[PDB]
Every structure is written in C-alpha cells, then in structure tokens.
User: Fold this.
Amino acid sequence: MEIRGIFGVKVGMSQVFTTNNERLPITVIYCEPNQVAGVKTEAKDKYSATLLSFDTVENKKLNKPQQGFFEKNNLKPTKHLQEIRNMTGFEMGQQITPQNLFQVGEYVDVSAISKGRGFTGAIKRWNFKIGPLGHGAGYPHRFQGSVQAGRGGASAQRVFKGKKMSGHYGHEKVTVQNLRIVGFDEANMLVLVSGAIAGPEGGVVLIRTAKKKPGVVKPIELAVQTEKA
Amino acid sequence: AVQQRRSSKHRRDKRRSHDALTAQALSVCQKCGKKKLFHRVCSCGMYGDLRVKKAY
Amino acid sequence: KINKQALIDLVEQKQLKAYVPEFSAGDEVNVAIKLKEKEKVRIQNFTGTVLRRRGKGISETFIVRKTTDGIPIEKNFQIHNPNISIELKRRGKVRRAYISYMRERSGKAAKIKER
Amino acid sequence: SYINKPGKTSAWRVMTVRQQVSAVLAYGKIETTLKKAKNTQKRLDKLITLAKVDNFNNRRQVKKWLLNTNLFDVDQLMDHLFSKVAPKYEKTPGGYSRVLKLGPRRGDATEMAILQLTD
Amino acid sequence: MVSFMTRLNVADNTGAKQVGIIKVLGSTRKRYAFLGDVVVVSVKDAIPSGMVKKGQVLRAVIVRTKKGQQRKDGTHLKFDDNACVLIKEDKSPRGTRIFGPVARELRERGYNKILSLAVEVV
RNA sequence: ACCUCGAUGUCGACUCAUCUCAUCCUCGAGCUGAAGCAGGUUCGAAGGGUUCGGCUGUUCGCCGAUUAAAGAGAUACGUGAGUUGGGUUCAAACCGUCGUGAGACAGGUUGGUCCCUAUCUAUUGUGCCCGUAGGAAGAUUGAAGAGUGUUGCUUCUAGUACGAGAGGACCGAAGCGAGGACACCUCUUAUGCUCCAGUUGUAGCGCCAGCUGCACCGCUGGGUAGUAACGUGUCUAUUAGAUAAACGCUGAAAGCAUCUAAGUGUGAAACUAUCUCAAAGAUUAAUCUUCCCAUUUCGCAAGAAAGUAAGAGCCGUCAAAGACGAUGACGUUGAUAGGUUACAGGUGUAAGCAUAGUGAUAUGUUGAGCUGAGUAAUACUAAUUGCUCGAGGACU
RNA sequence: AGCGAAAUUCCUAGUCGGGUAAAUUCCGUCCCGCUUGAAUGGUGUAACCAUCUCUUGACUGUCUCGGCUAUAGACUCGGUG
RNA sequence: CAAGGAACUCUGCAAAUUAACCCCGUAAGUUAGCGAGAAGGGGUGCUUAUGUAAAAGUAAGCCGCAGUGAAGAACGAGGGG
Assistant:
C-alpha cells in the first residue's frame, strides 16, 4: 500500500509500566529526521520508492563522489542510504518527523540486522536436541546427527542440497511484525517500542507500517504513578 | 578416512597457489638512513623520528 | 550526534514516584497493592521481610517474604510500579544487601535492628 | 585431557603482570611481548594513580601488588616511588607510559614491544 | 518446572500425601506445568483411612510451585513447595479444607469453588 | 546362485531426517438403513503434525494413561570413514538333553576391546584473482529460488434449529491457549576465574593488625557488561487467481433432457502470490545515479615517457564485527581503543581512630570502602614527520 | 526321597496372589516334570562375595533441557615436521 | 547451574549422595563369633573460667550465612539366585 519507513539505533532496552497492571519490556530507539535522497517513480523507474539518506556525518568526511553529488544535489552528508517501497508521499531532500508517519499506539513491523554470533554450532543454529550422556556413550555428543540417507549408486549416493548445517550465525537483515508503538519523544527524536529488537546496541533499525494489521490501531495507556505523600 | 588416489603436480601447485605471500609494509625514516616498516621502531635508537632508546 | 545512555534514564522521568522510601534487604515492612477486583480497587497488605533489593533505576525491584498458614511465601514487587504503598516498622541491621540464607534460615523471625 | 602442560591461565598472566610492573618500576623500561604490555598498561596506570596520594591505607593497598628483587626491596621500591616518581606524573591525566613496537623475536617471531616512561 | 512423574504434594483435606503426574494436558510434549493447569495424577502415597486410595487415577490442579511463576503484572510469586488440589472431574474440588492461601494468577481460569474456600486470595 | 566373497560390517537402541500415498487428524465434496449428536461410506487431497510410561536385548509386541489423531511404506531389514554394543555370532562356565569320546544344542544361563592426522566430489558458511569492457562509489529491478505454510479448548449466538422425550448442532465472532521458529538479557535464573563481600589454616611480608603463594578461583553469598533459557514479545491468521474432486446455468448430437461439446461460474489444509531471506558469475554478465580526468608529446595502432585531482590497498587503534580471512569506524584537524576525572550500577559501613568489654565482641567515625567489561568529558598515551596501486576511455 | 517354568520348562510372556496406574524381568505358589533328581550328589543352610538381578529412603545436568568460566588443542604467527 | 529427581536407560554404568572425631541409639538372623560405623540423630568455632602431667568435658559471653569452616575421608535397607 503506502507503508512508511523510519530509521533509528537501539540505544537501550528496559521495562515500561502500562495500565491494567501490566509490565511492558521496552526497547529504546534513538531516531533523527531523515533526508530524502531519491524518489523512484512508477513511471520514471517502473516502481515508486524512496531512497532515504540517514546517519548524518560531518561535511568534513564523506565519499568525495557521493559528497560531490550531495553538494550538487545541495543536500547534507549522511552515512547510509537505503530504499523503502511505497513510501512516496513527500519530496526530495526533506526532513521527516515520525509523528507524520505513525501513531503513538498503533502496530508496526521492524527490520534489523541480527547480532553476529560468529562460528556457531548446528545444535544452536538449528536448535536441536542431544540424547543421553550416560552409559558411556562415547566421546562425541555435539554433531549433525546422521548425514546418511542412502548409499550405493541406486538410492541416494550423496549428500543432498539444502541440508541444515552450521556456519556463521547472525548478521542477517530480518523483519519481525506486530510490535506495539508505545512512546514518542519529539524533544529528542526518539521512540519507545515493545518487543525485543534484533541485534546489539547501536545498530541500524528500520521501522515500517504493519503489513497485515495496518488499520488496526489501539493506543496503549500509560500507568501514571499514584505518587502521593 | 584416508586419501584414495595420489594428486598431480599441476593440481597440487594450484592448491599451493594460496600458500603464496603478499608484499610487506615499508616506511621511510629520515634522520636514520633506513627503510623501516610502518608503526615500528628505528634501529638508530628512535621510533619513527622520535629518539627513545639506544642506537641498536 | 553521539549516544549518552543517560537518555535511557531521561525517558523514564514520567513514571517515577517521589516518596522513595529507602529500605534494606532484611527490613520488616508491609507492601500494600491497590488491585482492582472487578470494580473495587482493594488494598492487599502484603507484610513480611525484605530479601533482595537490586536493579538499575526503574529496574530496581525487591522480594518480600512472610509465612501464611504455616507456609512460607515470597513474592517479587517492583518499586516504581503503581498501586504499591510501602511501610517499614523496624529498620533491621543486615551485613549484606542480599539474604539468600533467609530462604532456609527462617528461624529467629525477629532480626537485629540498626542503630 | 589427561596429564599434560598446566597451561598459562589468567592467574599466571596476572602474576607475570605483577612481576613485570615491579620490574618496570625498578628500571623504567621493559622489552617483552606486545600483548602482555597491552594488558598490564591499565594496571600499571592504576598503580601510578594510587601512588600520588601516599596514604597509609593506600600504602596497604599497593602492598598487595609488589614483589622482591635484588635492585631494591618491596619497601625500597615503594619509598623510592612515593618519594620521586609520584610528583613526576601528577600533572598529566593518564598516558604516563608508552608502548613502542619493536622487531620480531628471533625464536618464534613474536612481535616485541618496549614499555617505557618519561616526563 | 513440573512434568510427568513429578512426585508432588497435596495440601487439601484428603488422605493422600504424594501423587505423580501422568499427563499434563495441552499440545504434545507439554513437559511443563505451572499454576492453574489441570493434570491427571496417579496416587502414590495415601493413608488407608482417606477418601481415596493409592493407585487411583484422578484429576488434580497444581496450586503451589517452589520455583513459582510470573504474574502478568510483573510480581513473581514464589512458593517453597509443590502442592495440588484434587477435583471431582469439574470446577469443584474434592477436599474440604485448604491449607495455605491461593494466588489470583489462576482465578481467571475459573475454578471459583476452590478460591472461595482459599485461606487468602493473593 | 548373479557384478561383489585380494572384505557390500550387521539386530537394536540415540541423532539426522527425507520423499511418496494405498490419508490418520487437520482441508473439501457426495451417498446413506445420514431426526439431531455421534457417524459409516467413496474420492480429490501429501502443507503441517500425529504422545508418554512399565516389560521384553527384543525392532516388534502386550498393558495403562492422553490428544483430533497416536497412519503405512521406502531410503544397503537407511543411518560406526555420526556414539554404544544390550542381545547377537571367539574362547571361558554351569544347568537339561544328546554323542560313551573330543564336543553339540535353530536351548537357557554370567561377563566377555568397535581403528582412523579429511585426498577429491557433493554438501553448510566465509575469502582470494578475474569477469560484469575507461577507472572508481553507491542504489536498484528481479533471473532464479528457498524458509514458511501446526492447531486445541472455552464462551456467545443458543439448549437455538433439529428433535417430542432425553439429547443436541451447523455458520460466524471473541477470549484463553499449547507446541515449534524468530528476537533480546530490561522482569526470574545461572555463569560471569585480574568484580565485590564474609571466611580457614599453612609459609612468609622481622613482629601485632593488614596482606599475598597454596588449597577446584581454597570455601561460601552474590554480582558490572556479556553470555545462554527455564525469563518475555511476535508469528500460525486473512485474502486474490488458476483450481482438483465436487456442485452449476444455457445448451445440442439425442426436438426430452444433459456442468461440456461452444459459452458462462462456484469451489481444497495442495499450487502461483501476498508474510520472511536473498540476490545480475542472472556469462541471461542488466539498469539508474554520482565522482575522476583527457598534463606538449611515440612505438606492430597510440600513451615509450609525467601512471589521479577519485578511491583503494600496505600499517596501527579498535568493535555492534570478528578461527584466520574478511566487516565497519578511526587514523593527529583523532574520542577509535586504553589511561585520568566524574557518574551510573554492583558488592556491601573499608583501613585506621575513639568509646565500652579482661578477650571475643558492640557503637560512632561510615552506606563508608572497593569495583574487569556500563556512561560521559578529557589528546594524557597509541594510532606517524609514512609507502604502493591508482587518469588519457581499446571498438560498433 | 527330595525339589519341581529352576542357570533346567519348547509350549511360555503357563496360571494364581503381591509387585507394578500400567512389569515377555521379579517374589511365593499351583505338580502330568518336553529333557528334575539324590556324592558325573539332593534340600535347608549362619556369615561373606571388585557375584548377578529387582524394589526402596536419600542423591544428583543420566535425564527432564542444555548452557556458561579457565585452559590443552581445534584457528593464527615464527621454527621444525 | 533455578526446579523436578532414574521419569533417559539392557539395567542408578557413570556421576552425585555418605565420610574424620566425640556423645545417644541400633534390630532380624545368629553356628555367639558377628551382624555394627547396622538401621538412625546431636555437637566439633572464638574468648574467659572450671578444669588435668597433658587433655577431654562443662559454665558464661561472642557472632558468621555457614565453625574436621581449606585438605583427604563407608551412601543405605530389603527380596531373590
């Protein structure tokens, strides 16, 4: 449809107390008004999207090709540039307030790059189960199980493509939906969202409109303190 | 498990192609005539051009 | 711009209480919870002794333990959470900010008080 | 595994750290593996920071971080430090010592480095 | 952290002391049990003068967990024992006296006859 | 009675599962000796899933309990160059029998050794050179696929229809779920070994106190960042098209009639999408944008010779990276890492002084003291007074 | 005579009671016992077994359900190989 | 290492559980020797004093979360062959 997109950095993860006697763990995402760097059009580029530029840096340092383009475009130097589909409701070189994109209590989805786990194990990469260690069942216990399916030149004769095996874990741009918008901060351009944000602190996080519950908007009330001496 | 058939000279050389090494680093030291590699001390008793030790 | 992580505390300045009754792990207290029944927010007074008090700003919670019907029961309560009214009747004298042994050393329910 | 070398665990490393900070306080220059200097720099800077005050509690605290040598004893090293080295570095916020990368060792080509200090 | 064949106590006015879980209802491999769950139990320790005898297959509801469990609010109630009441195939129990308060974490599931005779509704 | 016995190692147990349908449930349709409910029946139908415990070496099999169900086969009676040999099939020993005798039992009985430094392909991740056609830097379309397509209970409609009476739905809606996968360590845990606290002796610091070497980090209680789940959030919905079986309208041959022949539809947990991954070595070599310049002047066809004004690489600091590689940031105008300072937070009233007690000990000093990784300012230190590749657009 | 599904019993996982929610194993019993049986000995038999088996209190990462701390490797660097 | 606690499994293999000293109590069987550390409980510290050749032990006060505070210390019972 017209899914909007905003960027931020996961600067913290705490709990925020909501009404009806419920504790809501909350990730804190520091944001900033992004600048439009490109506007793909259904006619000009066979698809309409927005190449948003974000993570602003000093004019002192930037890629001189890209920085020369930025001055030629008269824009400001930012570190990252990424595209978002269907977000074509504004113009070039424009700062965006998250207030104009989403409500304080509606439902959204969040894409992020997962934390790097390096050389993981298939027991943890695929979340498998290891049987008993008693009765002296040999030294090896953490392995991929039986890789044998068939043998001889008649049944399988090989390992098949698409086999669950270990390797590098994390560093994958994934998306998780149905995360409640909870709090806004226009004074410092920051958001307070429910759920557990993928990746470690300081990573780049994109927030988009909910894909399957966009029109579903139910605000979350704040548990005001009964503080009274 | 064990090797079944012996390899060939060309194949083993192609395998060893990754055993080749790259070029090292080389910087210039002015007061002491020497081409010492970068972020290292100078044998004339200095690091870079700053004198810190004995000339050895 | 560079992050500070003090903003984590800054965004939490809207759900704080100014009563801030300081206590210790081993204090003889009563915590009353203002819990709605369906209507009728009732005041459930949970008396007992403090066991642990640790956290980070808003995350600071505590454990209160008593004995009801001969059954020792302990429950966690969060400080900044609303509906929580805390009263302390005797400030104890505990050498540590945590008493794990008190889970089993239930003998001598009266504790030494500070001066 | 069964009977083999006992390893070089963190306890051995920190013991060597105490030995080497004692040595560098005795002399003022130590040439050794770079990695060990990288770890011992923090502890040496902390000891220097604690050496400015010269209070009996702080003396007792640093008592736990020296050793016995031939050039000077633990008391001799401590009094020499607290006498002359303490006011030497009282004007700079850290960075009292510098590690400079030397040439590789002859034996295992370990990257050698020298820890030194001066005003 | 209660599962199948977890020898658990009973704190109601009956003639048994220890029973054993045989199946925790739910999807296959539940393997966990917490407050408010309804389980099938085999009697393993019962006096001969009680209302029920050893080895009888019956239905129980666990009301105490030494590990405890977390309330939706955020107040984790932790017990020091693992006890359960016995029901007569409905929302009503079979004991006639409750020994110890019963929490509100399982009130929403129903079973109000048990909570009506509870020592205290936590 | 065979390619194989100059060797294709098995029964089972654990792990890995996959595919298929002669479908078990979940999906749909039709008939009934289908009042309802519960059904039986035949097919389309392979997306997901289909239990636990006792005994047997036993797979199997029997029994009990539970869900909607505890389906069936194949892959060398799959699965040791993934673990075990419980049985089984070395001698050893007995029981019952047989042979007179060595012994044997397709009888039981007790234990009774499972080798491997990975060459290649396939296969899971990550790099090196080149290509992608002047060089460099970003953003892409999508060529191709892959993951994923579980599902129960309660309530309302409603004890309503139906049914006479007991009994008792269908449709839809809401809530509660479980399970597995994804994500994080703020709530509960542990771990957290150069963090804190209490505490033991021994050998010493000459001695008292206080300390360190040793004792699993000496023991014990924890714990900063972090790590993991047993901690908490999401996910399974909904929907379009082609639709299978199936239900159809008109409508002939066959003047009736007919879902099919032309035309016109509905309709499946399956399929093409919509959820997620990913990407032009997609040689199918693509697209868009940006920057660099043509430093007089040659060669078998143009820059022998100044190889960039752009960038990258070598080297160092490192982390949100991270076996190495490689990723990203910083490289003196640098807060990138360390240190200083302060703070958060954790541990928990430090040493010592004074008072009381013969001594242990109690109180004030003191929530003091300390604190690897949490936060901020700080060039104080380390990132250099450095080097290399690196442009004239080969051609339509 | 004695013992008698036993180190013996194919049928057999024989029956029975206990055991066990649920036990082709176990305990005693039933005596037509395939092929038991009295120094190629038979039955009770005290104690004992690095003897075998079953149950039981406690006990635990055997398991439920795996994870972290340090090393020696596994990885890298230099020498050798 | 939070909880369960043999449920995994041919079977508690292994591991954990028990330990050393002093004080209570210890049964069946028994061939009188054993069983017996049976089965099971309490304490082990600091200071003063009572205490002896030395203690052990006891009284008062002192707390730690815990006082063979570290070290090394049988798990046990029943049935059957």
Residues 1, 4-11, 104-111 of chain D lie near RNA strand G (CB under 10 Å from a C1'). Helices of chain D lie at 10-27, 34-50, 56-63, 74-88.
